[PDB]
Protein: Putative acetyltransferase Ta0821
Amino acid sequence: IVFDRGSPSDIDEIKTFTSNTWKVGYYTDLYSKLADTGTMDDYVDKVIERWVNDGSVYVLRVSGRPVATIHMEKLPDGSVMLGGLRVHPEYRGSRLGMSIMQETIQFLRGKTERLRSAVYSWNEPSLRLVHRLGFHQVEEYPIYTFQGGSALKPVNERYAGRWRCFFIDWKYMCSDDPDIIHEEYSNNLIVDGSTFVYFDIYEGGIDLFVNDSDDASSFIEKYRSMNGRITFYVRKALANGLPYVPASSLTVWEYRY
Amino acid sequence: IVFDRGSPSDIDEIKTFTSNTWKVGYYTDLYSKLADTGTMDDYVDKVIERWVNDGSVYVLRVSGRPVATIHMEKLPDGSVMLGGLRVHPEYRGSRLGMSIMQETIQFLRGKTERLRSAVYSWNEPSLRLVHRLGFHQVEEYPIYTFQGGSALKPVNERYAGRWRCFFIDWKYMCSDDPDIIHEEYSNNLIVDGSTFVYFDIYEGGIDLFVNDSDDASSFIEKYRSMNGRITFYVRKALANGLPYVPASSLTVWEYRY
Structure:
């Protein structure tokens, strides 16, 4: 088993890989149902080809054949976000996930001081894997899904809020001066005072990451009505003031060299 | 392994049993988190001693020691509701669940034409068990949990609605004339026109089973504010018209002799 950069010739194989790394049987069916309660899978499905083509995808290979993927992306704060961990379906329940992560930690040693990754609160095997590898949870975003029935434009003002780490385009990143982060994903941000929301409109729905708000309930009540699947990933501290109790969350883990 | 009626002398042992019948390891931790997203466990915890004392609890015994429970209760439509399936924690991952269910099917043969049971939509091993045993899903109640912040009294009118099977006190029962079912759980029913709601106020919260409503959204919006944990179990056909998309549901399975 060799760790190598993914290439466009690997795309056809890569496209058959899944995030479902669980033991084949009852639990594989349970993974699928749980995965449907979030949108990370649909996100990665949408961008993984682009990633491979950009050179940000690494693979484990067996006799030159890719069997697992991991995506890595250096962030502006100097950390590296990891995700897009997928395995060929024949290898579910194996230790491929662990191996690719170990190769990744070694590969990034000296290149960054911090690694981050997003893990669903219900994904116990993955949570155990990151924990075992020496990551610790640093943040959490409870998930609220709406069936949008019934106009989303960026707002480009100053952030007077108090958070300095944010979820932007599925990357948890920090910046002392949020003005930098801001001018970079400007067409996908609603920033004004204490409001700091990253949005991603896609075919069939919209994901909103609520990083800050002086009134998250009102923000959700206003935008939940949009068309298709509308999903809010809301920072824990804010979620605490919402009426709905979510069944799950998107958690953020960090590893320090 | 002997199948016998539970007795009060079994209560101390029984009290240590859990609904968590999954393989010890990652998944047992996952069961607990999932179980917290509903209130069936808290219900059974509250009434199981009463059941044992009433003679409705049966057990599997090893050398006279109880190792598993099952509750059975004959309903007015002549069916038998089953639940409260629990095992001693040392026996998780065993086939005790299956054995107690097989003994139960045999034990009830000729006593009823129908068995029913409620299974969480995420409880894949239990869903597989009921399926394998020849049950089929007949209904489903998506679950909506609220954090009630801020008066719940029964309403005793005529049901003009069109449903004839209902969840009442955790039993799915039918009656041609809902007037019977009605006069029986009258202090726990809100019935008026198309509204047919069963409620159970407990220490720390309230569960509401919405069997019918001409406007479930309004019903939820009004009562979600009550104090403590407020959980609505809403009949699928109605849930379809609500803005929130639940992550899980309480499903109803039926077995026919």
About this structure: Chain B has eight helices and 14 strands. Chain B has one domain: 1-257. The interface with chain A takes residues 26-27, 29-30, 33-34, 37, 121-122, 124-125, 128, 144-147, 149, 224-225, 229, 242-248 of chain B (CB under 8 Å). The first strand of chain B starts at residue 2 and ends at 5.
